[PDB]
């Protein structure tokens, strides 16, 4: 049954208990942004990482 409207979904939907794993890759570890931050000595270009 559709959660928002309560109407039965026309196509019957495959439901069951499946085992799922949470991989170590998380968005908080990956989100990054740069704006005139630290700069390397030799190249005098923005740093890496």
């Amino acid at each position: 049954y559709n959660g928002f409207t309560g109407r039965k979904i026309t196509s019957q939907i495959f439901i069951g208990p499946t085992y799922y794993q949470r991989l170590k890759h998380m968005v908080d570890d990956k989100i990054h942004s740069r704006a005139r931050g630290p700069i390397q000595i030799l190249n005098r270009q923005p740093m890496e990482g």
Binding site: Y1, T5, G6, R7, S11
Partner: protein, 257 residues
């Protein structure tokens, strides 16, 4: 051009369950009543924890999570209690919250099961649905848990800890007559408990003029609110939301004029 007059027939009423049927109502109204059951019925649950000493294996925020999920009797005073935001006093006070305390140490050799029974409330009306018990942590000898918690009014839209219900079963058209679900092979499909069809007939004949009515509900209480008062509070809360909407709408119409 006006609202239909719904009717209710309660088939089952037990301390944990209410099975009822609402007839002559729209699908939108019925679904939104179910939705309010789930998310918009106020309840009391722990939302502030301060752990003085936690030597248990579980870390502090694990204990806090488990404490918040513990249901608390909110039958009468949840209507009396105010939201923390509404209350004038800073932080929390007897009107906006309820205080719980836990002071357990495993002095004995045998493992001590810290349960919800060990939580002690300052007001007798809110108790952790103890009258087994929910296990907060297991303490080895020499391990101690001490904490103070504050329980506040809220509804399940904020957090699932404030859900007053376990499972709301909502069904309409038990025998597929409006063809809202089109079975590829009708015979393979099990009959509903509310189905009135004979065993030979898998589906009722298509009703071209039909509209979803006679909705069947089974609302299972989590123990915090009685299953009857979950439904009553949901109806009243939906009516209050509509009335607030109407008040703001009237004010803005007056402003436009």
């Amino acid at each position: 051009p006006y609202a239909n007059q719904p009717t209710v027939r309660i088939t089952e009423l037990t301390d944990e369950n209410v099975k009822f049927i609402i007839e002559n109502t729209d699908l939108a109204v019925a679904n939104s009543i179910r939705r309010v059951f789930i998310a918009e019925v106020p309840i009391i649950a722990i939302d502030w924890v301060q752990i003085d000493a936690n030597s248990s294996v579980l870390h502090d925020e694990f204990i806090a999570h488990r404490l918040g999920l513990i249901p608390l009797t909110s039958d009468d005073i949840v209507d009396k209690l105010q939201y923390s935001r509404d209350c004038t006093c800073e932080e929390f006070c007897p009107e906006c919250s309820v205080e719980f305390t836990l002071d357990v140490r495993c002095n004995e050799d045998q493992t001590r099961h810290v349960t919800s029974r060990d939580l002690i409330s300052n007001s007798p009306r809110v108790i952790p649905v103890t009258s087994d018990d929910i296990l907060i942590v297991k303490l080895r000898k020499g391990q101690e848990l001490r904490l103070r918690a504050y329980a506040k009014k809220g509804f399940g839209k904020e957090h699932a800890k404030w859900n007053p219900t376990a499972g709301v079963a909502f069904e309409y058209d038990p025998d597929n007559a409006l063809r809202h679900t089109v079975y590829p092979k009708p015979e393979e499909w099990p009959k509903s408990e509310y189905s009135e069809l004979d065993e030979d007939e898998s589906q009722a004949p298509y009703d071209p003029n039909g509209k979803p009515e006679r909705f069947y509900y089974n609302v299972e209480s989590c123990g915090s609110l009685r299953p009857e008062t979950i439904v009553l509070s949901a109806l009243s809360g939906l009516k209050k939301k509509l009335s607030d909407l109407q008040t703001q709408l009237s004010h803005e119409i007056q402003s436009d004029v």
